[PDB]
Structures are given as structure tokens and as C-alpha cells.
């Protein structure tokens, strides 16, 4: 019997997601490593409870998760069960369908048999009547966007999903399926896209002024840049009373145009420095166009 | 085996709930307090049958009433399996999300996920397929209203809300609320405000004219001021005296004198208590003068 | 176990309601009496089984059908579970809500309360996924037909009620109705009036003439206007001469003023009743002699207004 | 327990059906016939995992494929839950409702009755959530269309079809009913018209064109004449063995080929009464190219031998 | 919704089952006719709310009783759960198996296979989990007695019956079924013969003391001659004129009288009456009203059956 | 929809199977073959319902009857299911385990853990609740018989079997399990070996005596020998003139022959097809032989070495 820590909301810093009424956390746990059957199930246990403790209270996944796939969405719905029972009601868990999940034609892209049937499976393995958040996990440009966009639909008009949201589209499609959601009187809810220091394509593309003029919130996958987040920057975090990783995950979260960012954990302690980054989210100019000359060079 | 009183819909006075064909009793019973698990399930007991019994169709609550929170909706929940089981169906049964609930940054406000997730945890400590009434229980200025009026679409598309209503909104958002809904082909049936001879933000702000032109029906919250309606305070029982009334009987009818009021909602902590409350009913015109001496005693106690 | 007459359907004919694709047979079983609590479940049971076997597939409920109400939803579902598990989706069975069914502001009327708990309850009471058709039972002056039109449509939704239909409606009410119900993309699918020889309000206001402009069926209710057609002596005079045209025409009383509500493609089926089954085979004979001659209609009419 | 061939996905073409995401295999198995109880499970079990041994992820049913009628469906559904509980969702399964069924004025037709209540009958039978496809089966006269559709429209919204498509309807009505189901949000995936070498109606009154203007996908049935491509009249007949024989081809693997030689056709069915069968017809996909020379000389051997 | 008599267990009398610690009440209701679909479910509705309102507790079913067969058991669950959900633990239901029910050889009898496949079809019948009493409704000279005394043993251990009965078994079969039922722990409860004025078997051949012996209770079945001691040869007609002389002496009907007889002592625990109405409840309750009969009275009685042939 | 004949019940004779009170056909229809996943349904179908129709009320079934193992279990629920729903308990149905079903030394023989877990596997399959008996279906030297028998008690116990028997037991053995079924209040109800005109082992042997003696029933598996009661030629002939003269075919003869008196109890008939029925139940026509003719039937198996 496991109490969940009664200060969890004091620290965690809470944005709206977009122009909608969730509020994710800063920082979101993402469940892409460390929780497959190949990872020992008490380690995961102590990550979950922790994140939770320290006011995570959204939990990212995908069918494909694991190694194996689905194995993170099982793992999850057993802690969830175990831990998690007097607390769905205060976590936003999503998954997603696009890659590669099961074999032939209809275990991969965007067709309405593969969302609809992998959110079937997802909510299985999970052990979830609904999940709070279903995507589209990439572009597929073999089906057309009209029966993806119409199959998140099914999913929300169903009672299978809360809301919506779409992983790695481009500003034009991320418009576009802006558009067809509306036509169901969805709105869009999130974009989560790769976006760190070292990658930009986010800012450059104009994909951030996509997502704030039509209301849609963004989530940051890969904010270290998968181990990346030279020497001199890590100086510049120094003098910021930061580590390095800190830092980049403040400078994601600098301004209100990043809702959250997407860390992971193979152990408990991990998360507690990640969380820091919160304290020190202010940056001058100067600082700003350092750190990018430093990047450039 | 407890049968209701035959005769309990001959007294009682029902009022269209603005332009839908749902009736309210004129006076409705709210579990806002005396049904928590700090108060003993016989006396709760007592008042549900009473309340029933005096033609009193319907029951108010809310996911925090209690205390604690969802105790006022589990032991309601109990006491209609047991007694209420054959009468359901005689029932109007509402419950609310707006307010804290649970913690944390989902447990409050106006977001499709506090509002659906708590439904389904009203439907379930309730023990019921559906609520008769689900109410948005405030504004949330963060949340676009877009999101709200979807998430209590859905309840009514998914067949767990019969209807749906909103308390506490300003006219202006009340307005907006009535035409996001009408989207979605479903009228606003009510609007809650806190309502009492005190506090009149109600008539001054022009709701009720919004309500009347859009149909929507209008019930009383805290019609009596939490107690104050039961110097100028002491002139205002002396009217009522005069009337053959209690306090807390003019403050209702007052309310109820005209046909802006749907329904006012009262408390009970023990079943004699409603008895006093219904007799309202049997005086519930006001002569001009009456209403102005009862307006100049308000302003000469700056209530 | 209980076998169904492999010929059921081949004397029996079924008229299209409607523009709708739905087929009714031309005459009904309505459950309005005979099937309470007060009259023995045998009878009931052998009126159910000659009636399917004569090619009836369409049997008429309500709520308040009994007594005492609700009664004969609960011995229809106990006899289909028992004798017609293989043979619902062969039927069409309709119920409605509208009149006073349980006590209070609740359990009358076409609030959306009322319509959507009582479907709830007749589902219940007859062991039921869904009906084909929903009705509501009345006009509600004081319920906005929004509401009401609203209420249908989500039993269609919902999957509760494939087709929706109402009872009793004016002209103008049934029209808009209608056009109400097509705001959902639902189309009313059947009028149920109450319709016969010496009652014909129905024609006179110009129902329908409504009814045929919108696509929609119409189901006459007490065909046989209580029994009168099977008081003064210019009336029972009237009601003898009646007869004998029957007579002239090979029929009884009962079968010509079916015949008669039947001459015409206006009207998509008769609803009769009956307290044993041998009252059945003589009223599906009137399909056996539907046409009537100019001449005929006019003596027809004559009797009625000299009586 | 039964392990999938893991090659499977290797040979079969699959093609985009219509403007849709659904990939449907160019070859797909219809249990029109075989599939009754007059035909030994046995034979049945090892249809159908050689058919998904050979990548044909299509099973095409109907309420009244037997015989007895919905005999298919049940055998259908039996073996899915003992050879196929972990490869549902690679599988397409279809089913229809608008032939004859039961008795009756509700066992036949278009209306909202039947449809309805055949997909739960259908659903039921092979112990199913839902059909990946369900189809009206043929035109009805007597119930408008906005009703046909409307019961479509239904059935994906309840959850009980993922998609919808129509069987042997005109250029016209396939056309109305691609703007009604329009006016519920949902696109027509797929037509499936009799279509074979002897018998062009669908190319004749445009259908074709109609379908690719709609992005509506097309699945051939009977695409073997029932027999009549495979090995006066007669003599037309031969020389189209024949051509198949210059082609490399049995008279049956041409007759596919010619189906699937461009991509209008997403799909032709064919049905088995034994694994063996399947093999050959697979090959077909070896050679799906004819030059105008050879279809001028089908056509005009069809012709000379009266084979329409 | 129906809310029993406050007062219903105030004048009723109940007696102790044999040596069991179950009482009876001195009247039961059977429900051998008038509770099949021949019959309107508001009768039948109004003779079971009646019963239990004047203190009746037991209710005895058959799985033939109808007609149709079945159709009792069937009526009587619907009434059950629409008024008698809050009181099933405050009623005795027992069913039977033995006489024919369903067609071929195994819907008669005493087989293990007929008795445990009609228990559990009564048990579906009426929505129970289990009766109160379960009976062998008759002999089976065809299986032997330690196959049947097995079945009634499997329906109690399975917790389908709590307690088992026999109907119509001679006082030696009697007591070689209370030795099979002994072998497995469980005392016979109970014995159901036809007895009435008329039809003294029961005494004449001492199973009244096999019963007594055993503690084994005795429920008398057509306690009333099926009509013959209510409202034929002269001698018949002038005996039962004369005894009807002595019910009204007694300040009791002929009905009341032969109820009363019945009951006069211990030996007896209940009798089962049956209705078509529930106004002919109340004159047979009354019975309990004067249950002595002197020497001379029983002499009497048995003297005018005599001179008038009436066995 | 199937309603059997209401005359199944009027020429079949049925006998008590040893002292129990439970009544076998004469003629029992045994699903060794013709019931497996490569026979054709609709034959399987047609062969139970003409059985049930002639009044054959006993189907004999075990886990491995197929072919492929189990599959006769499994269609033959699918037919109680859809056309025997009303009928069960007008039924008697019993499965067996003993012989090989499944691989591993859990799969065959006589443990507790076989013969449970089977039961389980067989009351899955044919969709039932409990069967009428259940079987061991034989010896197993390497299990004691005290567990055997213990198992067969469970089943009894836990209401998965009404009843128990064995299949293939010397008397000996027959006479142990008697005893130790005996000790949990269990009498064996049914013996069930291979019995025909041409072996008679079970007379030899004496098992009839003890099958008598405790009370056990028998019922005769193979009784046609497998095809052959359908030097040897000549007394093959010879026996086959002698059915002739008694107005019967070979396989009647054969089949009345172990009817001839009490001591079977009933005869374990196949059929591929419907029709091979009829024709074995008319054995029931002529069950009489005289001592002259058992005499001969014996001399010509003797000369013939039928043996």
C-alpha cells in the first residue's frame, strides 16, 4: 500500500496546453526506454511513484514502447493498477499509433483499421477504459488525412480518448489536420515534435507560430538531445548554478510557446535534478545569443 | 419495505424550468451539508423520505458535497438503492464539477478531463446509469468555454446527463454558453446563482432577463443567506410576522413570488424542518409597497 | 419447442410504410387489451402464435398497455423469449410513451425525461435490446416539440429504437415533427391516428394528405371503432343496412370497415385485437375483397349520415 | 497452436483501395462456396491459413454464404478464435446483408431493419466486435437510398464496421450514395461488382471512372466466370488458353492478370475448395502486363466467339 | 411497491417440524392449481399476498403443478421478485420431482438423472438458489431407494435444498429412506401423504408412528377430499349431511371442521390448503379456533363414515 | 427452428441399467466415427436428430473421438446447442478418458490429474455443465485404482457427472472399483466392453456375473465387429441364412442377438449417414431366439473359427 507524497503539487510548474483547459506538467515523463520487459519491474515501479511524487502527472507512451512492443503500455497498466488505483483521475497517460507495431499492411502508418485497432489493443494492455491523449504518432503520406483525422475522431466520440494530438507533422499538415478535427468540433490538443538546443527545425520551419495561432500546445521529445546535453556551454550552466541538462531543458522551457518537455528515467534519482531546471527558467538576451554562438561554432 | 406517502403530489407546486416541458417542485432539496459521513446515515435517511414524501421530486448535489468530498453522493447513492429503487424514475437527480475536488491540477475547473472524469466518479459513488442534471458548477476563466460546453455535450450524447446546466455565470457568459450548446442542438435547461433577498447580483445584472429570452430556467442557491434570512434584519421578521410567516419563510416566497425563480434550493439537518419550509407556498404575493418597505429596510441596514 | 407455419407469409400482404423501406402487413396486432395481468397468459400465447403464423409481423405496444400498466410489455417479452427467440428479427414491434404511466410530473407527457425513462422501462419490461419503432403517444402542448423530437432522436442514436413514429398529432403538429426530426437526419416514419367507417377525422383535417407529402405511414387505431362495427334506432338502423352491404360483398361488418381503411394505399395497416385466436383468420380474410365501387362508397357514406 | 508462415508479407502485391489508407491484397479469398457445413472443417482450416500464409490478409463474407445460410460465417468464426486470436487485426473481414436471408419482409432488401439486424446476426456468428467492411449487398428499389445509407452510417458510428462499401450498384447509385454517406462524414471505400473477362459491364457504363472520381476502391467477383476461365464458344476458348500459354499462364492466372493489369481493380476474389488451389492463382501477379495488341486480340476472340 | 401485514405472524399458529427446530405454519398454501397460465397472475397475485398477510409461510410447489407443467413454479418466481423480494427468508418454498413432468424416461420417477436435472429446472423456473424443501414426490418401485436417497443427499450438500422430504412412501420405505439419509448426516424433515377424514391410510397403517418414532413432520395433501368435506349414493349423502350437523354444532363449517380434525393433535404439523380467490383464506385459518375434539365427537365422525361408505 | 417427433418415444425399448433407476435406450449411438472435424456438419446433424427421433437418447462420446481428438466433443455441442437446447435432460451423454488425447505423460491413463483435467477439457468442448456418465476408459497398471476411483468420485461430488462407469476392466478389476466407489457411497452405474457374436469374453470371463451381482449395467461396444457381422466365408454364410430365416439382415441378428436377454443393457450402433439407423433399431422387431438356434449359431462359429 503506497501513499503518493502529499506535497506533489507545491513545486511542479503547471502550463496550459495551448488554448485549451489541461494543464501539463513543465516536465512529462516519457516511457520510450526503461520500461520494457527487458527492465526489471521494481526499477520501473520506483520511477513511476517518484514522478508522481514529484508532480509529474502525465505519462507518455506509445504502442510501440518497450523493448518489447507493447510491453511499456503492459508494465505501465500493471504499476497503474498496483499504485496507481486512488490516482487516474490525476494523470493525463497517452499513447500513440503510427510506426511500426505488428507485421502487413495494416501494423504501421495512419489508416483508420491500424488507429482504431492499435487504440484497441493500447487500452488493453493498459488495463484503461479511455486514454487521455491518443496521436497520430507521424505522418503517414499514403493514406490520406481526412481518414486519420476522422479515425482520432471516432476515438474521442467513442469515450477511447479525451483528446487528440499529433507527433512530428509538418506546419502545413499540423494545419491542415487543425482544420479536419474542426470539422468533427475537436480541437487539435497537441504537437509533439523532436525539439532540443542542437535541433531547431521547430522555431526555423515556423511550426511554433502554427501551433500558437491555432491554440495547440507542444511537447518537446528528445529535449537532451538523447544524451548530447560544448564544454563551453556546460560553462554557461555553471554560471547559471545548472547542469547542463538543466539548462537545456530551462531553455525549452524559457517561454510559453513549449507546454512541456519530454524526459526519462532508468532510476528514481534521475528525475529529481531534471525537475530543478524549473527553478532558473530566466534568460537575457546576451545569454540567449551566446549559447548560440557557442552552437554555431 | 418503505412506501411514499400517495398524496405526496397534491400540495406540492411544479414550475416549467424555463421553455423545456421538465417540471421542478417549487422547492427542492440540496445535500450541499447534513450529508456527509460526519452526519448519521438515519437522519439522512428521514429527511430523503420526507422530502419525497412532501412532493419534493428534487435532489441537488455536487461531486464535494459532504463532508468529506463524495461522502454527500455515496450515502445518497445508498439511501436510493434501498428506498428509492421502485421511484427513480419520479426523480430529478443533478450533481456538479467546478470546484475542488481532488488534488492536483485536474481536480477543479472547467477542462473536459475534470469535468468527464469526475462524472463518471459522481455516476459511480452514486450508483446511477445517469444524472438528470449535470451542471458545470462555475466559471473557470481559464478554460475556453468551447471545451467546457463540449465536455458537457458529450455527457448528453454518451446518455450520461439527461440535461445539462451551468451556475454562476454572468449574463454575458451564460449568453455564450446558451449559443455553444445550441451548436451541439442542445438547449440550456438552468442556470444556478446564489439568489436570496441580500444578494441580488441576479436582478441588478439583468441574468435573469438573459435566462427568460433564452429559456433557460433559474434555481435559487442560498435562498436563505446561509442563516441571515431565518436592525434592518429585525424589521425584515417583523414583516414576515405580519404575513404570517417566519423569516425563512417570506425569504422563500419572496423568491418564488413571480415566475422568474424555477425552484429555490433549502437544507434539512432533521425531516421537521421541511415541513416549515413548503408552507411558504401558501403565501407567495407581495403588494408593491410590501416589496419596497422590504427593499428601503436593505438599504437603511447597508445589507 | 414451437415451429412457425412455413406458409406464414404467403397469404399475408405488406404494404411499404411510407417512402420508408420498412414493410408492415396490412393488418396489425395491437396489445392494447386481452394481454394484462388480468387475462390468462395461454390465451395470450395462442393469440401471439396464430397471429405470426397468418403473416402478422408487427406487434403494437405502449407503457400503459395492461392492466394494470406495463403488463402487457412484461407477457409480450416472457412469450418472445420463450416462443419467438428465433423469430424477432422477423418482427416489429413498436411501443410508445405519452399517457399517465407512473405518478407524478415525470410519468406523462413528451418531456425528455419521461420519454427517454419509459423506453428504458419498456425495454426492460419486454427483455429487449431495442424496438423497431418509437412513438410518442401524444401531443404535450407544454413540452416544446424540440425537446420531444430530440428525445426520438437520440433512441435512434442510442441504438434503442430503430425508426421513430407519433400518435395522435395534427396536421400542423405532425408537420413539423417532421421537419424537426429531419434536423437529425431521422425521418418520422409512421402516424398512428385513431381511424375507422365513423371517424374520419383523419381525412377531413388533412393528415393524410401531410402524411403522404412527408413519406410518412399511417397505422389506423380502433379500425373497428370499439366494437361497433362488428345509441339510437336511426343509428342501429344505419348500422343494419351496413351490414348487409357486408353481405353483398361476401363479408362481415368487421371485414368490410377493414377493407374499407385498406381500398387505398393512404393507409399502411389496420391495427386489430383480439381476446382468441379464431378472431384473427376472419379479419386477415377482409384482404381477400378490398376494392369498393364508386356506388358503393356513396351508400356507404349515405348509411352513416342518414344514421 | 499455429504459427503463421513469417515470410507471409514477401510476394503479395497489395494496393491502396480507392483514396483510402486500407491496403487490400491484389488477390483475396471469398467464401462464397466451401465454406458450409456441408463441407468438412478440415478442408476449411487449411484454406484459410494457406491463404494467410500466402499474404491474402482479405476474407470476404456475406450473411447467406453457406450452404446453410450463414453456415460460413459461423465456420468462419470458429476457426478465427482457434487459428487466428492473435492475428485479428492483421485481417480484413467483410460481410453484406441484401440477398436473401430469412423469411420474411425484413430477411431481404435495404431497409434499416435488415441491414441492422444482419450485422448483429453476422457479428454474432463469428463472434466479432465489428467487421472491418460492411456492405449493402445489392440495390434495393424499394427503400430510398438515404435509408440504406443512413444504416451504413450507423454502423460505423455504433462501432460495428470500421468501413463501408456497396455491391453491384450502377455508375448512378453508387454515385448518390457516395454524397449521402458524405453527409454523415463518411467516404465509400469500396464497390464490388461482378467483373471478369466475359462479362464488362463495369467498364462498358463507366463505373470505373466513377469509382476513381470518388476515390472508391473495386474488388472483382467471379473473376473466373465461375469456371469459364479456367481449363464455337468453345473454340474462342481455346484460343484464349492459347494466348495464356504464350504468356506463361494458365487460362486462370491470365484471367486475374487481366483484372489487375491496371490500377483501377484493387482486388480480385477467388474462392478454394483446397489449399492447392490458392498457389497457382497467386502467381498471376508474375505477369500483369498486356500490350494493346493482346487486349485487341482478347476482345476480338470474345467476340468471335460469342462470349459475352 | 407492498408492504406485508405488520400483524401477520400474531395469530397464526406454527408447529415444530417433527424433531426439527423449522416451524411450520399449521396451514400451508399449495399451489397445485390455480397458479398456472390458465389462471390471471392479479389472482394468483392477491391469494400470495393474502397468505403471507395472515402468517401462511410455506408455499408448496410441485414441477408439474400448472397446467401448463412448470407454469406455477414459473408464476410463482415473477410474483417473488416483484413482492416478495425483502421476505424470502421469512418463507418456506419446497418443490417436488417424481410424477410425470417432461417426456421419455427420464421425466419420471426417482433416478438420480430426473431428480437433480427437475431440481435445477425448478430452481431456474422460480429464480432461486435453493428451495427450502425438496421432495421425492413418489415412489419409484423401479430405483432403488439409496439412488434416490442419494440425489435428495447431492441436493443439500450442493446448498440447493436445505432440507428434504418424501411424499406418499409406506411407513416401512419411510423409514428405510430415514436410514439412507441418516448414512450421509441428514435427517429426514418431512413426509406429505394424502390424509383427510376420508382417507385415513396414514393412520391404518401407522405411519403416523414412523413418523413420530423417526422425527420426521407430516404435512396432510388434500386435506379436504378435493371438495367432498365442504359444500353418490343416498348412504354417502346422508353421512355427510350428518357431518356437517356436527361442524355446525362445533360452530365451524364442514371445511373448518375437516382442517381442524387434521390438526386435532401433534402428529400432524400442517395442512395444505389451495385457493382460487384470497377470501377463501380467511375461513380456513379460522380453523385454529377450535382444534379439541372429545372421544364421543370422534366416535361419531367415524361412525357416520361408516354407515355411509365414505372411504 | 426443430421439433423432434412426439412418437420418438413409442417403439424404442429401453431397459434399467443394472439395480439403478436410470432407463438406456436398447440402442445407443456411439460417435467414435463420422463426428470429427472431417466429416461434413450437416451429416453429423441429420444423424442426431433421426437418432433422437427413433428414440435413441443415449450418445456416447470420449475425449479422443474424432478424428482429430476432441472434435466429435466439439461438434457435438455445437448440435445440443442448436438443435437439442430444449432436450438435454431427455438426454444422457458421456464422455471417457483413458486412452492418448494429448502429448506428455499427463495425456493417457488413469491419474488424477488426466482424468480431471480431461473432464474439464470435455465439459468445455461440448459446452456442458456436467455429463450424464463418465468414464475410465481403461485399465491403467500404473496407477493405483484408489486414485482412479477417487477421481471418478470427485466428478461425482463436484456435479460434473451424475454418473460413473468403466470400460474395458476384467471382473477383478470391475469388482475393486465397485468397492472403492463404494467407499465414497458411489455405486458403479455401467460397464461398457467390446461384446459381439463373434467375442465372448465378456460370457468367458464371467463379467456378466459380476456386472449382475453388483449391479452394474452393460453396454456393448463393437457389436457388429466392426463391419464383419454385415471356411470363414462358408460359416458366414451359414449364419447369415439363419437371419434370413428369422426375417433379418446379418447386422440385425448380430444386434438382437446380445439383446436377446437382460443381461446387456443396451448396444453401441454408428451410422455415417441417417438412414443405417432405421434399419438397426428393427432389430428390436425380433428379440427372441430359441435355444435350437443359439445352438447352431454357435456350432457354425466354431466350424467357421469366427473365434
Known amino acids: 500500500?503506497?501513499?503518493?507524497?502529499?506535497?506533489?503539487?507545491?513545486?511542479?510548474?503547471?502550463?496550459?496546453?495551448?488554448?485549451?483547459?489541461?494543464?501539463?506538467?513543465?516536465?512529462?515523463?516519457?516511457?520510450?526506454?526503461?520500461?520494457?520487459?527487458?527492465?526489471?519491474?521494481?526499477?520501473?515501479?520506483?520511477?513511476?511513484r517518484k514522478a508522481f511524487d514529484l508532480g509529474?502527472?502525465?505519462?507518455?507512451?506509445?504502442?510501440?514502447?518497450?523493448?518489447?512492443?507493447?510491453?511499456?503500455?503492459?508494465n505501465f497498466g500493471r504499476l497503474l493498477r498496483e499504485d496507481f488505483a486512488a490516482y487516474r483521475d490525476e494523470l493525463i497517460i497517452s499513447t500513440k499509433a503510427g510506426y511500426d507495431m505488428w507485421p502487413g499492411p495494416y501494423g504501421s502508418g495512419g489508416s483508420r483499421k491500424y488507429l482504431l485497432a492499435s487504440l484497441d489493443q493500447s487500452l488493453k494492455r493498459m488495463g484503461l477504459?479511455?486514454?487521455?491523449?491518443?496521436?497520430?504518432?507521424?505522418?503517414?503520406?499514403?493514406?490520406?488525412?481526412?481518414?486519420?483525422?476522422?479515425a482520432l475522431a471516432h476515438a474521442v466520440q467513442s469515450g477511447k480518448a479525451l483528446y487528440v494530438g499529433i507527433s512530428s507533422y509538418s506546419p502545413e499538415r499540423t494545419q491542415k489536420m487543425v482544420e479536419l478535427l474542426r470539422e468533427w468540433k475537436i480541437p487539435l490538443l497537441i504537437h509533439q515534435p523532436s525539439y532540443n538546443l542542437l535541433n531547431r527545425w521547430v522555431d526555423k520551419s515556423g511550426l511554433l507560430d502554427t501551433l500558437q495561432n491555432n491554440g495547440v500546445g507542444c511537447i518537446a521529445f528528445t529535449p537532451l538531445a538523447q544524451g548530447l546535453l560544448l564544454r563551453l556551454l556546460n560553462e554557461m550552466a555553471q554560471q547559471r548554478g545548472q547542469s547542463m541538462a538543466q539548462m537545456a531543458l530551462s531553455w525549452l522551457?524559457?517561454?510559453?510557446?513549449?507546454?512541456?518537455?519530454?524526459?526519462?528515467?532508468?532510476?528514481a534519482e534521475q528525475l529529481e535534478e531534471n525537475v530543478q531546471a524549473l527553478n532558473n527558467l530566466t534568460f537575457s538576451t546576451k545569454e540567449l545569443a551566446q549559447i548560440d554562438q557557442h552552437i554555431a561554432d
Not at 130 to 150: C, G, K, L, Q, W
Not at 262 to 267: E, F
Open 1 to 48: 500500500v503506497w501513499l503518493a507524497n502529499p506535497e506533489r503539487y507545491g513545486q511542479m510548474q503547471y502550463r496550459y496546453c495551448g488554448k485549451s483547459g489541461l494543464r501539463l506538467p513543465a516536465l512529462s515523463l516519457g516511457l520510450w526506454h526503461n520500461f520494457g520487459h527487458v527492465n526489471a519491474l521494481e526499477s520501473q515501479r520506483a520511477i513511476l
Open 253 to 267: 522551457l524559457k517561454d510559453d510557446r513549449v507546454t512541456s518537455v519530454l524526459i526519462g528515467a532508468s532510476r
Open 56 to 74: 509529474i502527472t502525465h505519462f507518455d507512451l506509445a504502442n510501440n514502447y518497450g523493448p518489447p512492443p507493447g510491453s511499456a503500455e503492459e
Open 129 to 150: 477504459e479511455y486514454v487521455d491523449i491518443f496521436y497520430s504518432h507521424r505522418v503517414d503520406e499514403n493514406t490520406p488525412m481526412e481518414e486519420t483525422a476522422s
